Amino acid sequence: SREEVESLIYPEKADRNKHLAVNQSKKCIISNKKSQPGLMTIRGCAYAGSKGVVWGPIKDMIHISHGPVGCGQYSRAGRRNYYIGTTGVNAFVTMNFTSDFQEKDIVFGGDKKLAKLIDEVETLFPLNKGISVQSECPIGLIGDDIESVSKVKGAELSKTIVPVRCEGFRGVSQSLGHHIANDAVRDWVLGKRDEDTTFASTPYDVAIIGDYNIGGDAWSSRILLEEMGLRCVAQWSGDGSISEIELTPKVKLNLVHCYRSMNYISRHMEEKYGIPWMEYNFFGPTKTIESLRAIAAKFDESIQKKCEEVIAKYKPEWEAVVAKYRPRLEGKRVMLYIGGLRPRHVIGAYEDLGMEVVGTGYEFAHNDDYDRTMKEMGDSTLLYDDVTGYPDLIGSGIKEKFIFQKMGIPFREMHSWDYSGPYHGFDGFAIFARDMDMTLNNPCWKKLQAPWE
Amino acid sequence: MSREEVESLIQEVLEVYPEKARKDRNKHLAVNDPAVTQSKKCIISNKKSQPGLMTIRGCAYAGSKGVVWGPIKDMIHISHGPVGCGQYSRAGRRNYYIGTTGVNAFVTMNFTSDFQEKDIVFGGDKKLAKLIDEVETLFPLNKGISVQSECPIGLIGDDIESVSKVKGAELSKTIVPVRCEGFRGVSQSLGHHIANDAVRDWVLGKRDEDTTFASTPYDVAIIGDYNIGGDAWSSRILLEEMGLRCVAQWSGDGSISEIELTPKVKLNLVHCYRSMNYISRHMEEKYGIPWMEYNFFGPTKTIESLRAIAAKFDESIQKKCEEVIAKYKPEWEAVVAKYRPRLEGKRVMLYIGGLRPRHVIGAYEDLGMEVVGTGYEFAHNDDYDRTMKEMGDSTLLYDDVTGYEFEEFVKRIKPDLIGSGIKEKFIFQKMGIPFREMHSWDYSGPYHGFDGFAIFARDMDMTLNNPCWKKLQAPWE
Amino acid sequence: SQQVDKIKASYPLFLDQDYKDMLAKKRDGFEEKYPQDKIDEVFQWTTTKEYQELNFQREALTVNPAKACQPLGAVLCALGFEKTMPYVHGSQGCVAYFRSYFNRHFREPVSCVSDSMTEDAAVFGGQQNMKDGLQNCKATYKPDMIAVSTTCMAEVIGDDLNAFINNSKKEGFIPDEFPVPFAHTPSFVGSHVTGWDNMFEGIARYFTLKSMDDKVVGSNKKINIVPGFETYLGNFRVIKRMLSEMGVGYSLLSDPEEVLDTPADGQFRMYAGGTTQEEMKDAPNALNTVLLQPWHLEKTKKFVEGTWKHEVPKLNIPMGLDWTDEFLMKVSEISGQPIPASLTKERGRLVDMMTDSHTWLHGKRFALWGDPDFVMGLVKFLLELGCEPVHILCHNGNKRWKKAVDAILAASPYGKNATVYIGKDLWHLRSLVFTDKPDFMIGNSYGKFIQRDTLHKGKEFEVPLIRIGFPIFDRHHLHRSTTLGYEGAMQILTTLVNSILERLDEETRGMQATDYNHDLVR
Amino acid sequence: SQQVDKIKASYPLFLDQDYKDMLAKKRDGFEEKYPQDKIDEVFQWTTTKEYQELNFQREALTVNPAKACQPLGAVLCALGFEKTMPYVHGSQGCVAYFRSYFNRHFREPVSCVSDSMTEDAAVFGGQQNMKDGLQNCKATYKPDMIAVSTTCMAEVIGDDLNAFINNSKKEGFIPDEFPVPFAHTPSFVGSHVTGWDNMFEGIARYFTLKSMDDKVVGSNKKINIVPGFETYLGNFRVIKRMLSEMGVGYSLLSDPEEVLDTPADGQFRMYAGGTTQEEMKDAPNALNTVLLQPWHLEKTKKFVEGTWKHEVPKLNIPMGLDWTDEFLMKVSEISGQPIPASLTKERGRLVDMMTDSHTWLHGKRFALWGDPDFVMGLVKFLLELGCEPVHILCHNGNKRWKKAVDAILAASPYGKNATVYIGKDLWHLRSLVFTDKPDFMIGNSYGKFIQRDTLHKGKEFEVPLIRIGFPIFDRHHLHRSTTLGYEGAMQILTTLVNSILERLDEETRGMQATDYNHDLVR
Ligand code: ICS
Ligand code: ICS
Ligand code: CLF
Ligand code: CLF
Ligand SMILES: [Fe+3]
Ligand SMILES: [Fe+3]
């Protein structure tokens, strides 16, 4: 009950009470504030939100982790943003380009080192279609000016070089990294084809924004969208190229998957180019059908007819998936804790498998995300914002994965899909239901107690 | 070691045997004399093994199924009897072949009747007939069946010749009954003889009245090369480079049609005299085909054998032989230049089955290594007649050496390298002496011919000069 | 031709153009080979369900068996006793094959002698062979005990081992007090595990049958452990380590781990360790006897319950979590020693490993073969992991064992598509993996050939092999592994999950084709 | 489309014809991709020696490094003490990355906290951050000790750890008696092993610098063992086992094996085991201190020699036969305990395995990388096996270490074709393995990408990766392995020989093409 959860909800300062609530979110929960020091939080940094999330999945561009070696090393290939390309030749997603700052670079700056690095990148990787420079913590503290270096080298090499001031100490979490990376996209990449009219546009031109192709989720969404008669001109960042970002201002509709990480750019495109945008949810058959119908409602009747055809075609497959896996998953309760979008976007498929969601929370989401989350959750459920480490299933990240695993609760990685996926679309729903069954009903959870104890 | 020291060592080793065992074993140990041409005056061979003395010899089944018949690839060989004999011999010999295993080649598979108690009590002739029917059903591309008898077959009175005759007449298929029961004889030599008799009686004369084969003056067959690691291939490439046409290969990578075509060749080149002299003499007395022993171990023996073979043909073959020798001279000279300084002066003790204890001596001498002890498991006295002139003076000769005997000989002689089988390899690796498997080529090879000499030299250097042999004693002892 | 700077062995020397040309000339001129289209047709036929129906109708033909003969197991049992020489009455070729087999599996010297019975002994028996062989063996190799088994030749002619040995002692060939236990091990009955059982029962009967008057059950406060046919040294080591952890006094009967793992220190040790004759004589005084592999120790169980009066517990092989737990609890109940905290922590660590790798292991399909106890323990562990043991083959299995394994499979949701085959060989399993393809095979080195066959049908049809069992010839030092206990379960789990991961990496290594799933983190 | 009876994950779901067509449409319509012929040409160019010459002229650009930053090693050192919380003064994203890295490698919970320094700390410093963080950490997680390292931001802005912690104690945020050792870990200096060295030296100086007046060397008859940056739990276990077998009293300083191997029994233990504060306080009373990894324990060595007055032996990492022998002999000399017969038998068994596998191991060419001590121990062992370590890369090595490795290589005839590189990354190694192809690679999971690249050039140019080192992400439970001592040498030798044999089996699996060498017995 609500009373029980309130009773369930540290020195005097440890704020934490405002970030915990029982399901205008601002009057109920307080979000996007500083983490309490020394409390083992899950939050990343602005560099992770910019390099690791927004810019890193862009395959034909080379992203330089400007600064010491650690930040680039720990984020190398850790995110499963899938792509197609020849790595090291025309795609560089899983590679780690770093300036590897030393003591002399801290003392005297690394602007000359950055220029030399850009020259060497051009020499050794000629097929790169652009360079981004993701700043790490020392860059903004030693007075380095990467904007001037980027301008000079871009003019000299006729290359698009995007300086991103994504120093980790900026902001409270990866959300400011998302904002900074979106601003960099707007300032350096988005408006490159403003005077270019050589692109042949169609009335059914859509772009996919904020889908990072985790396990191929964006591909599973795109196949449904194109089966519907639409043309996905742009799809970034997941399996995204720089040309797609440049061609995004030419589409007729923007489909934003992660509102948290791309609302800035969606709003900017709406003000500037007049492109309407809306959110879509392809998680679970019910949300997928609802989103497909809503998308088709923005076009002529032929798109709606093709949408009905697609829904009818895919109905038997997800119906068979439900018939197979729902009996093994009825009456199971789920609690979640993911970064900024998934904590409310995953409820649909859990309900489509007969599961009850009793808990969710966000690492870094803002109060608008909690506004959206309130209706998606039932009452008397605990909501937590930036909850510290201190049900039948818990869906969260890798760092809490092993804590909850050793506490005995079956756990699912809701960041990387536990190295599985995709989870979006109908094929994603099939994979997701199979993974839910394999994790929840595994015998390994029945053997935690020794028979002699 | 001088002659008297070797005789004294033989006496000390024999001292621990019982009276009968010591008297029997004194006839199988000798000090070599290269001037002696009659080996029965110094050594006695091809005798019964002393019971309970850990001999290395196999059985007649091993000499027949594992040696002569098994390498035939398009034939299916049934280990008739219990499961063990066929199981332990499955793919244990590296007689290389080309073919699709289970479709048209069956060398590495184990076909057995898997005798049970009822088969022992009531016989296995009906089981053999039904097995032949099932083989024909499930392996239609087999070009013949052989039935290798294990020990119980000859003790329960099973008539496999009659079954083979009836089923061969019914299926128009060549079914060869081989009476290679393990208790027969004293070693694998009787197995070789029985398998050769079976080839003569069931396979060799199938095309006696056939004349459709187009014969050339340069027609040769390779008899007794079982392609251990591709040895027969490395010999055959050299033979074909001299302008000769190798028609048959016995039996490594050998087909039944090559055996049937062998009586059409102009020369028989016998590598293993021990296992194929019977069939070579039969072919001489029946088809008038001369046979000669060759040696392709090391460059000097390969060159001598090539010239001797070319001397049996016209002058064009001799010109081609000289061209081949000239072509391969720089390569083996480079091998010698690289590896002889690493191997010169080292001493080798050998103990192999019936041909290699004397055939590989030239290869060792080509690298500067001297053989101080050698012996056989199952050789006859003609093999020792050929062996004494090859061995040096005052060296050791052992026939059917026992584990204790050969261990003591190694302990007193202290060689740098030992070449023997798998049942002594780890004994001598633990004793600290570098060991090279001279049966399977230590899963390396080939060793025949010029291409094999490079591998042989590299393997000898790798084993003999490995750092591990310098690390057996703990530094705190 | 060879380059002295880069010397090629057979592979890839024979892939050269001249060697390929020579082989093609040979094949086209004299081999009378079937056309390649016919060979491909027959192979595709062998991969079908019709061929499977024809294959499973076999009654007289056995192709690629998965078992050996009894005297091999008898030799393995005899090697586990202190300064004991295995002596196989019969033909010497059998002993040569036994020694070669064990040398290839263990890469260690294997001591075994024969009396070399020949054609003459086939008429008047091997009495003289036995007398001379016993005298020669004792004089030459100086063993504390000679353990005598038989080959098929000695069994068929009906040689009386007891009478022969008694006569040998009567004429003075060997001392009357010298221990010469014997066992009849007919190769046409059972398999190598049956021979191990027969040899152990013979040794136990020789040392304990006539001296049961002064024996009191439980008077030495120890538990007898009979391991059976075991070719993993880690299994002996883990059983001894776990029994020492619990504080339990134990007597491992037939312990060959020392003689099969001798050091290379410049000297050769014919004997090392082993069960002592004092332990065998004192065995009836133990609290109880535990048979680690009960499904091939039936004769041993009959003797131990009938003569030693030991209430042998009904225990499965300590393979996997649940059966290791039951073995530990039974040992705790017999000895009275509580299970210590270290074993509980080891169990928890195994469960942690199970939980870490359950995503990759769940639902994976396995064909598997081996000996009855090993196969059933592996099936039990696979069911504990969420895997599907589709094809369960045991050539030396019987109907009762198949019924027990079916009862195990029926108690798990993951045994639905599982079928148990007994009396079937590896050609049957080849047909099974062609018609009902599993994800992996688990078995000895012979299964490698099956993998080759599957790869001939296509890369998508290839069934990779996981080498667990006996014998493993194509890999080194795998005989040092462990399959029993929590340590063995962890080793097996690591092997399985990492084999899955290597297969996934190989299938996703194609650049710009499948490398989108070539994940750094798995 | 998905079949409910056979559900495909991303592989091979995206190989379906509809997915393939959609991806082709994407690429042809909107990606503006370079033509496949240009991509192939550029890849072939990257595989050449001209590209390698350009690559090795790199001055400012680092591609695919083989090292991490200092606070990671500091966290790993702090995790090795009893109920100790790693506390990284600086930004929280660093701690998130550290925990994710160690979680992926060990598949265990990793405890670490940050004071979450932000732009406000960029101007005034993180003094308030330190006070609040220490207070909250002590109140929430109740540790016995908080070990403080720094991120690059705190080092750049110049935060005084000593003054900050002293002020925190003076203002009552933490008790004056609560242990808060600290270390400055500038991520732009050295690598993670440097961070481990700095953290250990800071903890030792905290616990021993002010209380040296009552310390007598050898008064507790113990030897201090400092393992350094170690990511194999088997290494800690093998060192403790070897010292216990010798009967040697020891104190393993910074022992994290217990907290990185917590059992899954239904409760979460944030702390488990570790070096106690009493052990660290009594450390100056030991007979001597032995550094397992001397090449990244320089600062620790200066502190132990200059303050504890310990004559630290000049010992290499106990990796392989010779160096394990010298380590055991030095320990025997220091403690006066003779080397027992069990260790001698273990050494003999390792030598026996070496003799068994030398034919397959001899002459094999290797590219290897990792930390300095690990790399040099691997090179020494490979030379002991008759292998050829052609490429020896160490991104965090120095000139003195390179000189030592060159001296090691010069002493062996197998190190003639060996080159040592320092300051080079995995792109340099990719160029090296393309232009001078080795047989195998030894390194962490990152080398897998190099393998993929080699497979792109051809199957005859593919360099397989043998996964030994840190971090290993794509395989499960390999962190449980051992690399030190005779046991670690046996594990490494088995891995190497079996990788060689698996590669040979894969190369010879082609039916009627290369399966003449598909030997059952190897
Ligand atoms: S971008 Fe964000 S933490 Fe919106 S930083 Fe994070 S691939 Fe999460 S809840 Mo990892 S705001 Fe994406 C996210 Fe959500 S990396 Fe992925 S799963 S939908
Ligand atoms: S056949 Fe004989 S034991 Fe002549 S049974 Fe044996 S493949 Fe030996 S010395 Mo193994 S008479 Fe051949 C032989 Fe020599 S199996 Fe090979 S190596 S040249
Ligand atoms: S000497 Fe030779 S190998 Fe020996 S049996 Fe006889 S033919 Fe055969 Fe066979 S099944 Fe086992 S291994 Fe024997 S005891 Fe019988
Ligand atoms: S919050 Fe973010 S990840 Fe942290 S440093 Fe800052 S940009 Fe980077 Fe980098 S090298 Fe190591 S991991 Fe840091 S201490 Fe510096
Ligand atoms: Fe060995
Ligand atoms: Fe774990």
Author numbering:
A (entry chain A): 5 to 13, 20 to 24, 27 to 35, 41 to 407, 418 to 480
B (entry chain C): 4 to 480
C (entry chain D), D (entry chain B): 2 to 523
Q: What does the study report here?
A:
Nitrogenase catalyzes the ATP-dependent reduction of dinitrogen to ammonia during the process of biological nitrogen fixation that is essential for sustaining life.
Like MoFeAlkaline-inactivated, MoFeΔNifV showed similar SEC shifts in elution time relative to MoFeAs-isolated and had diminished levels of acetylene reduction. Likewise, EPR spectroscopy revealed a loss of the canonical as-isolated S = 3/2 signal from the FeMo-cofactor in the MoFeΔNifV form, comparable to the MoFeAlkaline-inactivated state. In our work, ~39 moles Fe and 1.8 Mo per molecule of MoFeΔNifV were detected by ICP-MS of the purified protein, suggestive of a full complement of clusters. The Phe α300 side chain is flipped in the disordered α-subunit of MoFeΔNifV, however, His α362, His α442, and His α451 remain close to their resting state positions in both dimers, preventing the formation of the histidine coordination site. In addition, while Gln β93 remained close to the as-isolated position in MoFeΔNifV, Trp α253 was observed to undergo the same conformational change as observed in the MoFeAlkaline-inactivated state in its more ordered α-subunit.
